[PDB]
């Protein structure tokens, strides 16, 4: 998260950490949508161009954390995966279309003050809230700055980061990049003229884009961090997987398994 702040404790109890058993490494971010399911970006699991094709047995999911690096004894809960489900039409080949994936824990996680799921938007929330100019939040332990030889400094955060950003209009999104965009994606970020900063960045993929509902006091998960071109660049916005759009796939896996 570029230009965010530390998160406060229990601010995002649905934030999950995708961690590698070996070598120990943060792979990505995820979201707790229920007690036996986590949502994340497919590209965290499968990206051939970079050689990623992980099995259930190569990862762990850590829920309840604040520290990035510490083992939060008695706070976090570490879970094993039972199975991974990638949208069958996920396109790693070109634009990352349909970059979403569910994971099924081996055993249900117990909720606490630090672990609690997020809701998934319905038609009505979706239409009320995903509108241009409206702000959502993004969290992650991803990089703090876009990677560059010339960066002097820690590029890593020591505690979860937060950043609120406004959702942008399709046409502005579509014109800012040359990657082919689809309706399954949304872009969020300050426009050139609002002269402000903030963004997701590498290592934040899989994390939730959430919005809070004035209509009911609940936080809904609106998007998944998916891609971008650099981090915080001028005239650029980051892309998120449109969760509502793909809710049907989501319900189906969750209902057969």
């Amino acid at each position: 998260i570029v230009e965010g702040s530390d998160a406060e404790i229990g601010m995002s109890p649905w934030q999950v950490m995708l961690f590698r058993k070996s070598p120990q490494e943060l792979l990505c971010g995820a979201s707790l949508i229920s007690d036996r399911w986590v949502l994340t970006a497919a590209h965290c699991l499968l990206y051939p161009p970079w050689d990623k094709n992980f099995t259930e047995n190569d990862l762990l999911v850590r829920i309840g954390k604040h520290s990035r690096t510490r083992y939060e004894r008695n706070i976090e809960k570490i879970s094993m995966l039972e199975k991974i489900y990638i949208h069958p039409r996920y396109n790693w080949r070109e634009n990352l279309d349909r970059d979403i994936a569910l994971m099924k824990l081996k055993k249900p996680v117990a909720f606490s003050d630090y672990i609690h799921p997020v809701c998934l938007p319905d038609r009505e929330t979706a239409a009320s809230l995903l509108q241009a100019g409206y702000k959502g939040r993004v969290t992650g332990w991803g990089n703090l700055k876009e990677t560059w030889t010339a960066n002097v400094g820690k590029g890593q955060p020591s505690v979860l980061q937060v950043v609120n950003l406004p959702i942008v209009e399709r046409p502005v999104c579509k014109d800012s990049t040359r990657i082919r965009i689809t309706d399954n994606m949304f872009c969020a970020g300050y426009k050139p003229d609002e002269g402000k900063r903030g963004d997701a960045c590498e290592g934040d993929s899989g994390g939730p884009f959430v919005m809070k509902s004035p209509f009911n006091n609940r936080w809904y998960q609106m998007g998944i961090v998916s891609w971008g071109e650099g981090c915080d660049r001028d005239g650029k916005y980051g892309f998120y997987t449109h969760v509502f759009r793909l809710k049907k796939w989501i319900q189906k896996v969750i209902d057969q398994f």
């Binding site: 404790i9 809070k212 809904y220």
Partner: peptide
Amino acid sequence: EADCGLRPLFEKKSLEDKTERELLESYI
């Protein structure tokens, strides 16, 4: 889940985060 989206330490206790109002104000 039935209790989704309500945070134990915020919502469930009528407590506010250092930055959520900025979220709501954009809805206006």
